[PDB]
Amino acid sequence: VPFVEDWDLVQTLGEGGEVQLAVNRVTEEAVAVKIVPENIKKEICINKMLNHENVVKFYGHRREGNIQYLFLEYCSGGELFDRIEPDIGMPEPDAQRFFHQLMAGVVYLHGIGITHRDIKPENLLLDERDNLKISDFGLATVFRYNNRERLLNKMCGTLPYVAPELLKRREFHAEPVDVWSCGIVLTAMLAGELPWDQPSDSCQEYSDWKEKKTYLNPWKKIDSAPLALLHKILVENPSARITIPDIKKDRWYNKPLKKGAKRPRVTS
Ligand SMILES: NC(=O)c1ccccc1-c1ccc2c(c1)Nc1ccccc1NC2=O
């Protein structure tokens, strides 16, 4: 079938090079095209690994000289970031559903030995049905290979979402770092604000949290059941921090809160 390989670039999705919303000339299928060294070669390689309903799908890549094109799943719902109302958050059942989907995605990634390393609401994309998808594997790396764990040492992520061990220790396990960023994402969804600039003793807000001053913001806006979960996630010691199998056993995580998607109905 002719022209099925042609895509029109219709809108800029952000700055990374750049990312464009591409529409197929024949089928009108929407895809996200990432337009760009060894850093992109690693992103393509990790993306070729990924196959999950809560992970942005990689369709392929093409090279045209110095320009590399990455064909990725387009998520029409945009970023989770824009579902968070400043200093308010979002309804608790929506945040619980987004957190369930975030956990399923992170369980998948850790299962194949991949750590994202930069989980934040700007990277958590939503599809047409508001299904959360983990995106941007530009800072992602392999932490388990041939069933052997590789401890990490590289400084990366975004400071409000980074685990405290990254700023304090030379080496750290990959998985508790992603669990921590997920907890900061959960905090943002329920309070509409970030708890600290960075998780260090020099940060008053971080010291207040370790001293359990939950009568202060953002913790005052958060109900006791999700707050009890945040108390288990945001634990300074990464070895004492709750693992994902135990997050799945938490009382709020298993609390019936949200109704299914409004399905059409008639009466009489
Ligand atoms: N998250 C990314 O991979 C990315 C990296 C750098 C710059 C932009 C993006 C990006 C890619 C795709 C989307 C996106 C940002 N966000 C977005 C914003 C508004 C509407 C739709 C989308 N969907 C998307 O699928």
Q: In this structure, what CATH number is given to the domain that contains residue 31?
A: 3.30.200.20
**212 and 98 within one domain:** yes
Q: Would you say the CB of residue 99 lies under 6 angstroms from ligand 1? A: no
The residue whose C-alpha atom lies closest to atom 16 belonging to ligand 1 is 78
**109 and 239 within one domain:** yes
**80 and 90 within one domain:** no
**Which residues have C-beta within 8 Å of that of residue 247, sequence separation ≥ 6?**
103, 179, 229, 232, 233, 253
Range of the domain at 218: 86-268
Contact 124, 182 (CB under 8 A): no
- Residue 81: which of 69, 73, 89 has the closest Cα? 89
Half-sphere exposure of 28 (CA within 13 A, CB side): 0
The ligand 1 atom at the shortest distance from the C-alpha of residue 123 is: 1
Method used to determine the 3D structure = X-ray
Whole-number Å distance between alpha carbons of 258 and 94:
7
Whole-number Å distance between alpha carbons of 184 and 233:
9
Phi, psi (5° rounding) for residue 124? -95, 105
**114 and 222 within one domain:** yes
Resolution (angstroms) stands at 2.3
Q: Alpha carbon 80 to chain centroid distance?
A: 9
Whole-number Å distance between alpha carbons of 34 and 36:
7
Domain count, the chain: 2
The residue whose C-alpha atom lies closest to atom 14 belonging to ligand 1 is 13
Contact 136, 123 (CB under 8 A): yes
**130 and 21 within one domain:** no
Of 47, 65, 85, the last residue of a domain is 85
Q: Would you say the CB of residue 32 lies under 6 angstroms from ligand 1? A: yes
The ligand 1 atom at the shortest distance from the C-alpha of residue 122 is: 1
The ligand 1 atom at the shortest distance from the C-alpha of residue 15 is: 7
Of 85, 120, 148, the last residue of a domain is 85
Q: Give the Å distance between the CA of 253 and the centre of ligand 1.
A: 28
**242 and 131 within one domain:** yes
